[PDB]
Structure 1
């Protein structure tokens, strides 16, 4: 029994930076209509918090992104977040997450970073920034030598990258914000498309 089961099932994790006019509930529905029931609200704006609050009942597995301290981590959880994400590994955020019994996906890049995370009992890791660092080819090398790690790649991933990611066996989901630009029929399309480019 997996707490990231929803995540594993989408294979897809949109990220959202709130500018404050978004139709959140609208978005929520489209996402869940399309087979994608997780979403990540970045805390790069205080409105990211208000948006977790607003989406609490939405039925989405909600993630909090850019969580950069134990306090920001606590705040996210009290806002409705079910999992935490940060760009690099914060041991103190992992201590908060294990304390509250919620999943924490620290970002990693190097094999050494992978061991360090593993050493904290974390085996579901962000890979960030994925595109500049050659996500697909890197996660292919980690499939062999880290057979126990699942990865959440994010960072500059475009649609055309998807079929390459879909062939990897150590893939938890692919993250991005690219999915979410446009209007509700726009976003739906992109989601439906990325959903299809993964598992063909």
Structure 2
């Protein structure tokens, strides 16, 4: 499921907006840009309500899932409001077991090999390289040797100049944020079409 969706689409989107309207406007803008994967991070107030309202974009063909889920109650709200996947910045055994029971694709974040191996010993083989500005481009490549069976989703410090410089190193789907979602929807929606063409280029 989610694994092959990620492999096929090749980009996610982490939306951080302050109102509960500018969320919907930028969700629509990125959709028209070409991005079918949308992540509603719970820093947006009533982000469960925002997912519930964007429900109609699942019909047109988008994928709406939570983000920055740091507690079991937040995971409860996300899975109730129809989020298709969960994303946290840190490992959480409790959230992992809950998502295992409920059958929801959970994608924890890892920074160092101890965290990484603690993850792999629990089942999640592809994780979130938070942050890909500190750890860098040469961490996933330098760590293909020891572990060649894990694939990363480098959510941090991603832009035009090094968007497929991480695809060359073997990442799945570079989750992007503030490079996209910044400005009027007519610019958010036109600047997503420059990442999607560049990812589809390399």
Structure 1, 108-117 or 142-151: larger mean CA deviation: 142-151
Matches within 5 A, 1:28-67: 28-59=27-58, 60-67=62-69
Matches within 5 A, 1:105-124: 105-124=107-126
Distance 1:47 1:161 in 2: 33
Structure 1, 172-181 or 27-36: larger mean CA deviation: 27-36
Distance 1:129 1:88 in 2: 11
Structure 1, 156-165 or 96-105: larger mean CA deviation: 156-165
What is the CA RMSD across the aligned residues, in angstroms?
1.8
SS in 2 for 1:49: helix
Structure with bigger helix share is 1
1:125/1:151 contact within 8 Å kept? yes
Q: Given the two structures, how large is their TM-score scaled by the length of structure 1?
A: 0.89
1:166/1:197 contact within 8 Å kept? no
Task: Give the structure 2 partner of residue 78 of structure 1.
Answer: 80
Structure 1, 182-191 or 105-114: larger mean CA deviation: 182-191
SS in 2 for 1:12: coil
How many residues align? The count is 196
Structure 2 alignment gaps of length 5 or more: none
Matches within 5 A, 1:155-174: 155-169=156-170, 171-174=171-174
Structure 1 alignment gaps of length 5 or more: none
Q: Given the two structures, how large is their TM-score scaled by the length of structure 2?
A: 0.88
SS in 2 for 1:166: coil
Task: Give the structure 1 partner of residue 147 of structure 2.
Answer: 146
Structure with bigger strand share is 1
1:18/1:48 contact within 8 Å kept? no
